[PDB]
Design goal:
CATH topology: Lysozyme
Oligomer: monomer
CATH architecture: Orthogonal Bundle
Distance between the termini: 21 Å
Strand content: 5-15%
GO molecular function: beta-N-acetylglucosaminidase activity; identical protein binding; lysozyme activity
GO biological process, one term: defense response to bacterium
Order of helices and strands: HHEEEHH
Helix content: 25-40%
Keywords: Allergen, Antimicrobial, Bacteriolytic enzyme, Disulfide bond, Glycosidase, Hydrolase, Secreted, Signal
Radius of gyration: 14 Å
Number of helices: 4
Protein name: Lysozyme C
Bound molecules: sodium ion
Organism: Gallus gallus
Largest sheet: 3 strands, antiparallel
Shape: globular
CATH class: Mainly Alpha
Number of strands: 3
Number of domains: 1
Length: about 130
């Protein structure tokens, strides 16, 4: 599923991501924009052989099981495929664990490089929330 900007902002708000660990909803929408272009089916292979999955490009090194990332963990206790669902519940629940891990949203390199410190409220501007 390719979400619309305001459609995804509403789905993230409904699942409790708005101001989760102090990160306003525009932060999460901005991260999803640059990670996946709002596509739940986004995948990216890393040089290390891990894979990033879904709207927030969650990695198999730590967070999900894909059966093909040697030495990895599955801290969200999900198959990585769950992160590609049209239903963002697995992505959001796992993002909550990631952003609680110590480095906040820096865990998402695209958030640090493209969202951090910018006017992230522009990502929810005009959305009925
Ligand atoms: Na894994």
């Amino acid at each position: 599923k390719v979400f619309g900007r305001c459609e995804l902002a509403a789905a993230m708000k409904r699942h409790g991501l708005d101001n989760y660990r102090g990160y306003s909803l525009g932060n999460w929408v901005c991260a999803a924009k640059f990670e996946s272009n709002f596509n739940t089916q986004a995948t990216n292979r890393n040089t290390d052989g891990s894979t990033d999955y879904g709207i927030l490009q969650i990695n198999s090194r730590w967070w999900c099981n894909d059966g093909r990332t040697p030495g990895s963990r599955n801290l969200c206790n999900i198959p990585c495929s769950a992160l590609l669902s049209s239903d963002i519940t697995a992505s959001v629940n796992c993002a909550k664990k990631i952003v609680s891990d110590g480095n906040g949203m820096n865990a998402w390199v695209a958030w640090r490089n493209r969202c951090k410190g910018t006017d992230v409220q522009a990502w929810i501007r005009g959305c009925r929330l």
